[model samples]
Target: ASEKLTFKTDLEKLEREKAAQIGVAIVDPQGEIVAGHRMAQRFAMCSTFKFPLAALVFERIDSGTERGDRKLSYGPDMIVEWSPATERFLASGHMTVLEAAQAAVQLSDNGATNLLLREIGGPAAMTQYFRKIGDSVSRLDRKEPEMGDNTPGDLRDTTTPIAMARTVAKVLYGGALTSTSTHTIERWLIGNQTGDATLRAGFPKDWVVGEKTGTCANGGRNDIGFFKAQERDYAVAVYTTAPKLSAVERDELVASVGQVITQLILS
Candidate 1:
C-alpha cells in the first residue's frame, strides 16, 4: 500500500536544495501506509525519539503499571551539572513526572527529558520496547541524562523517515498500546514544540496536526507529524541533515519541504 503513492523528484529537489537527506511517509487511518518516499532510509531521529518513548509510557499505563496523571517531583535530583540551561531550570527543582513529560514534549526541555528517561529505564529499555513492537531499526542511543555530553554535531540518535512514519501509524492504530494510553500519548504529541514548517506549513489554522521537531546547533532540523485533511488522517515525517548550512538556511529548507508536502497532500 505504501508503494502506490507516486514518488516525485520535486520532493527530492527540495531536499537537495536544503542540503539534507529527507524522508517522508503518509499513512491512512486503516493502518495501511499509503504514501511514502525514502521512508526506510536510515538517518538521525533526534528529539523525535520522544514520540516512541511516550508510547512506551502509555503501554505501561495500559498494563496498569503507570499513569498519565502520575506526578513525581522532578524538581530536585533532576539537575545535571554540565548544562547551564538545565541547571538553571532545575535550580528551582520542582516538577511532576507529568510536568516533566509535558516539558519534554511541549518545551523540548532537555532536563525533563532526562528525568523521564530515568523513570522509563533508559535507552536500552527504550530500544527493547521498540524492537518488541517490530520496529527493528528503532532504538534510543542517548538517554536524556547524557544530553550534556552527546554532541548533536555528531548525530547521536538515528532513524529513517519511513521508520518514524511507520511508528506513528502503529502508535495511532497499533492496538498494542491501550486505548487510554494511545489517547494520552497522542494528546501529548499534539503539544510538540517544533511546528513552524513541515506539518504546520501547509494546513488550515483550524486543521489538527500532531507533530515533533528536532533541531541542533550543527544545522539539523526534522519534523514528524500527523495531519488531518478533509476528514482523512495522514502521518508525515521529514528529517534533515544540513551540516554546513546556516540555521536560517536549514529552517527555510524545512519550511519549504513542509509546504510542498502539505500542498501535495491537499491536492
Candidate 2:
C-alpha cells in the first residue's frame, strides 16, 4: 500500500511519533516563515543561548567596549562539569575572549559560556539585548550549570522556536549586529563541531551549515542556526523535550527533524 502525505502533514506525523514536546521554525533570508510547528511555544534553550550571547559579545566588540583579543581568566566558579573538549583550555586558567567564544559555540563549553556571560555583564543584560533586537519571547535567566538545572521558580533560559530562527535570520541578514561582528559570529558557528549528529547530520555532505546545539538536564535538546542552500539560504531552529530518551536517541530525533526541513527547502 502506497500512502503519501503532504509535507506539513508528514512533519506533524513525525512530531507525533516522538515522546518529546517538539517545536520547529524554518525561515527564508527575507524572514518569511516557510514552515513551523509549535513555533510560539517556549522551551529550555539550553546551550542554544550561546548564539545570542555570542552576538551580544560581538556587539560589545563593535561598540569598542570590549575586544575579542581581550584576555579573561577562568576562576574556580567558572569551572563547570560538562565540557570535556574545553576542559584543558579552562584548566589553563585563561584565554582570550575570542577563544572563549569559539569554545562556547564549537564545544558548547559551560565554563566558557559562564565566563562570557560574566564578561558581558550577566544574563539580565543578555536578555535585555535580546528584547532590544525584537525577540520578545526569549529569556536568559542564569549562567550555565544553574540554567541547565530545573530550579524552582526559574524559567530555564527559554526561547520559542520561531524566535530562535528569526534571531539567526537577523544575524545572517545584518539585522542583529555590525557587519564585522556578524561575520565573526557566523564563522564561529560554521566551526561548530558538537552539532554534527543533530541538524548537520541531516544535510548533504557538502552543504554549509553554521549551527549551535543545546542539551539540558530537563529533557531539552536543540539545534538552531543558518542553512545555506543553492536556491536560497534559510535559518532553522528545532527544539525537543523528551526526558525518556538517551542522548543518542535525542540526537537521532533532532536529525530526523532536520531531514524534514531539508526536504521542504529542497522541494
Candidate 3:
C-alpha cells in the first residue's frame, strides 16, 4: 500500500484532478486555526456575502439604529433573477427588512439580498463592517448577482478562507455579536433551504449545522459554518474554483472535504 494521504496531499491531489483552486480552513471552538490550504488565498464570495450582511443587520437592529420591522419598498425593476423568495413579494411591492434578510440568508434570493444591502448602506459600508470585525481580506465591491460573477483575476467581493472562517466563528461563536443578534442569524442559517449536499452532507442526519453557501457564475462554490461536536466545537470553510466546474462536481468536492474534516475532528 502507498503512504496514508495527509491533508496537504489529499487536497493537492483533489485540486489537481479538476484543475481547481481550493482554499480551506478548519478552526477549533476558540477560533483557532487547526488546518488549512491556501488559507490566505482570495476567492470571490458570491452569495457568501450574506453571512456578513446578516451580522451587520442584526448588529444594527440590536443597537436600535435599524428597525427590523421597517418596511422597505422595491419596484419590479429592482427584482433580480433567481430571486425565488423576493419574486413572491414583488406584487406586494414591499417587505420588512427582517423578511428580506431572512430571504437573503435562507434562499439566497438575489433581490432580497439587495434590499438588505440597501438598508445597510451598500457595498462600501459592508467593507467597513468586515474591517470592524477584524477582517482585512474580505470586502464587497458590488451588489448581488453582479458581484457573484467571481470574475477571473478580479479581486472585488472576495474573501480568504481563513478570514471567512474566523469571521463566521467570531460572529456566531466568539461572542462578537449580542445573543439576540446571534440567534437572529442562527434562525435563518438553520432554515436554509439550499446546498444540503455541500457542507451539511458531511455530518450525520442527527447533527445540527448552520451554514452559508455561495455559488458564482464563472466558477466558484464555497460553504462556511460552525457545528457543535460531541466534546468540542468547530468551524469550517471550503472554497473551490475552476473555469468549468459543474454543480455536481463542485458539491461532490466540497462534500469530500467535509468528510475528511469530519473524520479528523471525530477520530
Candidate 4:
C-alpha cells in the first residue's frame, strides 16, 4: 500500500509537470485500481472506441450472428482522409468484416471504422453494448470524419479514463467472450502497426504492449491497453486534451506517463 501511494503521488507530479488536462487509470488483473488521477472525468474517445467496437463485433460473430469472413463492398462514401492503410482495400472496393476490424485498429483507419460502424448498425448499438458490459459512462454517439470535428461542447463519443481502462480489462481478462474471441482481439492488438510515439515509446524493448492510440483535432490523444511486466500484467488508460500542445508534445506527455507507470510496476 505504501508503494502504491507513492506511485499515486509520482503520477500526480507528472500530471502537473506536463501542464495538461489528463486522466489515467491503471489496474491489476483482478480489476483493482492500482493508481489513478482524474479517472472519472470524461473526454472524447476518438479512435479508441474501435477497440470495444471490435469486441462487440466479435461477440456477434461468436453468437453466429456475424461471420469473420463475411464480405462487404467498399464504396466511395466510405472513403475518408488519413487512412493510408485502407487505400488498398478501397482499390479492391471490398473487404471482409475481419479485415475491416483489423484495419480500423491496426492503422486507426477511419474508412474501415465507418464500414464496421455500418456493419454493426451504428454508434447506438455500440453504446448499448457498452452499457450491457456495465460501463454506463462511456458512449459512442458519432462516426468517424465527424468524430474529428472538435466543435466546443461536443460530448459525442466520449469516455472516462477509468471506463476505458475497465473496458480493456474486461476484453482481455474478464472472461467477457469465448477464449477464441479473446485470442482474436489480442492478436489484432498485438499486430497493431501504429506509430510508437505514445505508450509504445515508454516501454523497455523486452516488455510487451498491446495498445490502441487515438488522435483527434484540437490535441486530443489517448492510448489504452494491456501491459505485461516481468512480474505481472496490468491495464492502463491515459487520456489527454491539450489544445496548446503540438502533436509531438502531446505524445511525449502521454509517453512520459507510460514511463512513470512502467517504473512503478517494474520496481
- Cα shift from native, residue 107, model 3 (Å): 0.2
Model 4 poorest ten-residue lDDT run: 147-156
Q: What local lDDT does model 3 show for residue 45?
A: 89
Model 4, position 175, has a per-residue lDDT of 80
> lDDT per model, in order?
0.68, 0.81, 0.84, 0.84
* TM-scores for every predicted model: 0.83, 0.91, 0.94, 0.93
Tens-digit lDDT track of model 1 for 101-218: 6666666666667777778888888888888777777667786534323255444466777667777887887677877667766777776655665457655776778888776445
Which ten-residue region of model 3 has the weakest summed lDDT? Answer: 1-10
- Provide the lDDT at 85 for model 4: 57
- The local lDDT score (0 to 100) that residue 103 gets in candidate 4 is 90
Candidate 4 per-residue lDDT, tens place, 93-180, comes to 7889998888988899888888888988998999999998878889887889787665656777789889889988988898888999
> Tens-digit lDDT track for model 2 on 160-253?
8999898888777846678777877888888898888998898877678899999888677899998888857888898888777888989998
Best by TM-score: 3
Cα deviation at 156, candidate 2, in Å, is 4.0
| Cα RMSD for candidates in order | 3.7, 2.9, 2.2, 1.7
